[PDB]
Amino acid sequence: HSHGLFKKLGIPGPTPLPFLGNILSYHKGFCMFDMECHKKYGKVWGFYDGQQPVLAITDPDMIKTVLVKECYSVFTNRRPFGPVGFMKSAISIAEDEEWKRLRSLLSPTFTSGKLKEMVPIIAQYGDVLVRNLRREAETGKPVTLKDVFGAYSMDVITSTSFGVNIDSLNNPQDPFVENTKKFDFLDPFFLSITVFPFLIPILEVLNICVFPREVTNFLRKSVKRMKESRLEDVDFLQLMIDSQNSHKALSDLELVAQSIIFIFAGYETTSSVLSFIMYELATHPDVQQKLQEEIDAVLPNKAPPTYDTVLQMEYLDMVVNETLRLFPIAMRLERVCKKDVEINGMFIPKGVVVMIPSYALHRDPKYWTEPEKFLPERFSKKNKDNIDPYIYTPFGSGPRNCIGMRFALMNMKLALIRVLQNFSFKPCKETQIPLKLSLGGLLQPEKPVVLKVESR
Amino acid sequence: HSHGLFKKLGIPGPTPLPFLGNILSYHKGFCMFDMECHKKYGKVWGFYDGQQPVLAITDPDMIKTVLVKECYSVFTNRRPFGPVGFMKSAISIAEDEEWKRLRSLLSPTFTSGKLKEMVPIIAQYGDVLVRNLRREAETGKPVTLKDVFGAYSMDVITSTSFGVNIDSLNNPQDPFVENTKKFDFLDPFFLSITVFPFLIPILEVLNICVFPREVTNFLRKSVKRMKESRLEDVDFLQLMIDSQNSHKALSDLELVAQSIIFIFAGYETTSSVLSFIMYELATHPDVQQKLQEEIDAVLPNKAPPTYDTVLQMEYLDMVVNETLRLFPIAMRLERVCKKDVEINGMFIPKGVVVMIPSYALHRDPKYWTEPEKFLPERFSKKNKDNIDPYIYTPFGSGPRNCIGMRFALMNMKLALIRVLQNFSFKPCKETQIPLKLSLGGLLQPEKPVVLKVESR
Ligand code: HEM
Ligand code: HEM
Ligand SMILES: CC(C)(C)OC(=O)N[C@H](CSC[C@@H](Nc1ccccc1)C(=O)NCc1cccnc1)Cc1c[nH]c2ccccc12
Ligand SMILES: CC(C)(C)OC(=O)N[C@H](CSC[C@@H](Nc1ccccc1)C(=O)NCc1cccnc1)Cc1c[nH]c2ccccc12
């Protein structure tokens, strides 16, 4: 029906089947399709997620236009997603003037000023991590990183965001811990979404929420207790409540929505990435040692890390940066074109979803040498300059980039510094080498990362 | 020529003489003209500063529209002022997109976060004040407040904004001190401006600057030394340099311009107001004692004040608030209407300067009882609620309000707490009672405030 679009424009792509579009091509997962598409077709191509035209662009002047130059005018929202229900107000979801309000009202949550105030707390759980890690290191049992990293990152969220302090590895079943741990695209549901996006309004009317209709009701209330327990008697909720004291302040259920996408991401990104990094440290043993040295020449005597010294560790930075090059958990960035528009000499008509294929661009040999080896020296202050910030985009770019970037980078670095101060990480046999990525829809490993840990 | 405007609109006012407009009416100073005009004419009137129509509005729904609701759309800039030269870029001066850039790029200079970081410094000079005050208190010589307060506030600026630490009362002639101390409306010049505003372009072409063409050249350079002396080896300049590291960063001479209007205001407002307050404490002896008690029940043993406890002193707040009611150093707020527009049912045509007569409204019996007595209980948490924030406007309102409000309130409170911890202030004979305001163009006293100081 609407499949003629790129045939007209003179824009190339894979021919789309009726109804499906090009979705059968995701049997290899988004990343492989993107990569293949980049090389078969070059710098611009089109496909159809159902009847939804998606235009993939790989020019960094053009990417800059979409992510930064013309964000407010044309390319302000991401792809409609559903059913959400009361999570329509979550910032990552919200659109246009509702977004801009929330982004403003939630921006100073992550300033150098407030990020630095959170450092002492994100400390006390790095220590909890060591002790939970040493019990697995004096008992030579290979360690599922995501698990031990998960509970750590989880401990950081509840703390950085509500107060609630839990040894979540130890209290894996505390009511605040169950809820919070709780399929995403490429699975039985969202493929149907993309083929039956007309069926989304069906469920919105049904209180059916992708976020299960129960985890929400736990934290909706648990907040308005906390709300009514410190009021009256440092974290994200606190920082959000003071802000509803221009625009229109912050409504009550809008607060619970932003908390949820804060609890995710702080959990699943931070812990997912720390395992990609630790897998990389194990499989490239020289880098781990180089880092363990710098960690120690800044913080001698296994010294506890601080704000200013974490930004002082450069090899630490380069390692994180390079792990994210190889695993940009986002994979793609996306904005809905809201007007007939022409950027850098190309007509983009209304409603086209515009897509930047991060994962593919991070592995493009046209910009990276040996792009699949793990080469942390790419990010040296010698070579960091020669890197197009519109090709390397692990946090997006522009006014709709990741709001948690600074906190995310600091969360993970405070982990590694503590964790590399006391242990070293060797591979095991059941350790997956080389790591295989999930054929699914998420930048996650086929098999969880298991490594051997050793006390120093 | 253009004097028919309010005669048409059906808007009332004093009939304007040719060329002059209504300026001869300023022989009683703006405030008295505003007050008289409010009572002769009511809620809306017009006059002509030369050929410049000025519409004075006293309705707080309408004031809110002009200062907050429609700031960005219609009422975004203040009255053209000149000649300025390179001070065209100073934020208080700049217009529209240049302003909004600078206001954004200079906003997080004054956050709770950064304001709190400045508290320890604004301390060490409160102490310098005591010792400079005790030399005048063990030597019973009546004290010119503006002088001792001036050097204090001056000490705070150079410190809060560059580093340079001077005992300016002691070093009254240090090169950084002379410059920085350096007629404003109602004097031989600006009256000619308002009658010959066509002659402003004349001087702009002449490097003639109201800011003398020399003080600027001192600080322009003194900065690019400091710029090139900490780079590389907490204050306003530092906070401004890190910010040029969306929009278009911060250009180099734009930095010097914002520094100048920072050095003023931090000097002349802070010290001007502290003398209005201390004059008031002397002439109303009961309030001074009430305050000296609360200052001591928060900070016992002449304890040094801190951030959180300054916001804890409520009678301190009420006193400042009420002094500003009686002396709003601004007197008037103003915005240039940039479109034919209709707010709250009144046509305002392009180019009309829109004026809110703060001083008059703070003394309006229609909103204030005994509005001229000094009654600090007006601002009690019992009665503070019954106060239209669009009548009481010592810092303006809305997106173009005073950016230094929080710092100003905290600067002055840290002064009074220290100064009232060690001294009490009695009037003298040559002390002007009742204070007379300058017939001139500035909210300043006819005669400087002299009081008797006594050690405790
Ligand atoms: C390694 C950690 C993380 C990575 C790689 C990451 C990556 C991203 C990316 C690529 C985007 C979209 C950028 C764009 O569209 O241009 C994004 C958005 C976002 N991220 Fe993160 N993120 C991380 C962690 C976090 C954390 C800890 C938070 C904390 C709450 C957070 C909050 C958000 C939000 C709210 C958005 C939506 C931005 C918006 O739509 O306004 N992220 N993230
Ligand atoms: C008792 C102290 C002060 C009072 C009563 C005061 C009052 C005001 C008022 C009424 C305005 C205009 C508001 C409006 O147009 O709606 C203003 C503007 C401004 N004030 Fe203050 N002010 C004070 C101190 C300061 C201080 C210490 C600074 C520090 C640098 C400062 C910086 C500014 C700036 C930059 C503007 C221009 C705002 C703009 O045009 O964007 N002020 N002040
Ligand atoms: C942004 C549109 C409207 C197109 O659809 C999405 O909302 N997005 C998708 C689906 S639900 C996003 C939500 N997830 C979440 C999942 C379970 C429980 C609670 C929340 C979210 O905001 N998590 C924050 C986050 C995650 C990763 C990195 N940083 C921040 C997922 C998504 C993939 N990458 C993103 C980048 C930004 C925003 C969303 C996503
Ligand atoms: C705002 C327009 C463009 C209409 O003309 C002015 O720029 N304004 C007038 C004249 S020069 C403003 C400048 N003074 C200054 C004087 C000598 C040396 C350096 C700077 C300024 O910005 N000082 C900051 C300030 C002063 C008082 C309270 N807070 C902040 C003066 C003026 C009276 N009340 C204001 C309120 C806001 C901005 C300016 C003024």
Q: What is the DSSP letter of B197?
A: G
User: Hey, is B2 helix, strand or coil?
Assistant: coil
Resolution reading in Å: 2.6
Give the three-class secondary structure for A371: coil
Burial class of residue A277 (count of CB atoms within 10 Å of its CB; 0-12, 13-18, 19+): buried
| Euclidean distance between CA atoms B260 and B336, whole angstroms | 24
Q: In this structure, what DSSP letter does residue B81 have? A: -
Determine the residue of chain B that is closest to A112 in CA distance.
B113
Q: Cα angle vertex A401, ends A395, A406, to 5°?
A: 60
Residue A23 alpha carbon to ligand 2 centre in Å:
59
Do residues A309 and A328 touch, judged by C-beta distance below 8 A?
no
Task: Please indicate whether residue B329, judged by its CB atom, sits closer than 6 Å to ligand 2.
Answer: yes
Tokens of B147: 């002088």
Q: Print the SS3 string covering B293-304.
A: HHHHHHCCCCCC
How large is the angle between the packed helices B252-266 and B145-161, nearest 10 degrees?
A: 150
Ligand 4 neighbourhood includes B402 CB (under 6 angstroms): yes
CB contact under 8 A, B399 and A68: no
Q: DSSP characters for B229-296? A: HHTT---HHHHHHGGG--TT---HHHHHHHHHHHHHHHTHHHHHHHHHHHHHHHHSHHHHHHHHHHHH
| Way the structure was solved | X-ray
Residue A44, beta-bridge partner list = A57
Name the minimum distance, in Å, from the CA of B183 to any CA of chain A. Answer: 36
Closest CB to A113 among B113, B246, B399: B113
Q: Are the C-beta atoms of residues B367 and B388 closer than 8 Å to each other?
A: yes
User: Is B337 annotated as a binding-site member?
Assistant: no
Contacts of A256 (CB under 8 A, 6+ apart): A86, A216, A219, A220, A223
Which of A112, A245, A247 should be substituted to probe chain B, the one whose Cβ sees the most B Cβ atoms within 10 Å? Answer: A112
Domains, in order of start, for chain B: 1-456 (1.10.630.10)
Residue B340 has which token pair? 């034919």
- Output the CA–CA distances (angstroms, integers) from residue B74 to B9, B70, B335, B341, in the order listed: 19, 6, 9, 8
| Residues of B within an 8 Å Cβ radius of A | 68, 108, 111, 113-114, 246, 398-399
Whether A84 lines ligand 3, by a CB cut-off of 6 Å, is no
Chain CA centroid to CA A331, Å: 9
d(CA B281, CA A5): 77
CA of A125 to the centre of ligand 3 (A): 26
If one counts every other C-beta atom within 10 angstroms of the C-beta of residue A455, the result is: 11
Q: 3-state DSSP call for residue B218?
A: helix
Q: Which residue numbers come right before each break in chain A (C to N over 2.5 Å)? A: 182, 233, 245
| Residue among B305, B334, B320 nearest B120 (CA) | B305
Closest protein CA for atom 36 of ligand 2: B402
What is residue B314's three-state secondary structure? helix
User: Which atom of ligand 3 approaches the CA of A330 most closely?
Assistant: 34
Query: Are the C-beta atoms of residues A133 and A422 closer than 8 Å to each other?
Result: yes
Q: How far is B210 from chain A, CA to nearest CA, in Å?
A: 34
Start-to-end Cα distance in chain B: 64
Could you tell me which of B186, B180, B193, B185 has the C-alpha nearest to residue B265? B180
DSSP B322-390: HHHHH--TT--EEEE--SSEEETTEEE-TTPEEEE-HHHHHH-TTT-SSTTS--GGGGSTTTGGGS-TT
Q: Which of B68, B104, B111 to mutate to test the interface with A (most CBs of A within 10 A)?
A: B111
CA–CA dist A362, A326 (Å, integer): 7
Residues from chain B that touch A114, judged by Cβ atoms under 8 A, are 113
For residue A397, the ligand 1 atom closest to its alpha carbon is 16
For chain B, give the residues followed by a break (C–N over 2.5 Å).
Answer: 182, 233, 245
Q: What distance in Å separates residue A298's CA from the closest CA in chain B?
A: 19
B273 touches ligand 2 (CB under 6 Å): yes
Residues A138 and B296: their CA atoms lie apart, in Å, by: 58
Question: How far is residue B29's CA from residue B21's CA, in Å, rounded to a whole number?
Answer: 15
Minimal CA separation from B113 to chain A, in Å: 6
Burial class (CB in 10 A: 0-12, 13-18, 19+), B325: buried
d(CA A447, CA B388): 64
- Cβ–Cβ below 8 Å for B399 and A246: yes
Cα distance between residue A445 and residue A384, in whole Å: 28
Least CB–CB distance from B113: residue in A68, A114, A246: A114
Running DSSP on this structure, what letter comes out for residue A396? B
Q: What are phi and psi of B363, to 5 degrees?
A: -110, 5
**Residue with CA nearest ligand 1 atom 22:** A402
Contact between A88 and A258 under an 8 Å Cβ cutoff? The reply is no
Cα(A12)–Cα(A14) distance, integer angstroms:
7
Residues at CB less than 6 angstroms from ligand 1: A 67, 91-92, 103, 261-262, 265-266, 269-270, 273, 329-330, 333, 394-397, 400-404, 407-408
Q: Whose CA is nearest to atom 26 of ligand 1?
A: A404
Sheet with B353-356, strands from edge to edge, namely B44-49, B52-57, B353-356, B333-336
CB of residue A330 inside a 6 A radius of ligand 3: yes
Angle at B293 between CA B292 and CA B295, to 5 degrees: 65
Torsion region of A47: left, alpha or beta (phi above 0 gives left; psi -120 to 50 gives alpha): beta
Return d(Cα B335, Cα B398) in angstroms, integer: 12
For residues B260 and B269, what is the distance between their CA atoms, to the nearest angstrom?
A: 14
Query: Which three-class secondary structure state does DSSP give residue A334?
Result: strand
Q: Cβ of B38: how many Cβ atoms within 10 Å?
A: 19
Q: State the SS3 of B19-48.
A: CCECHHHHHHHHHHHHHHHHHHHCCEEEEE
CB of B265 within 6 A of ligand 4: the answer is yes
Four-CA torsion A417, A422, A426, A429, nearest 10 degrees: -110
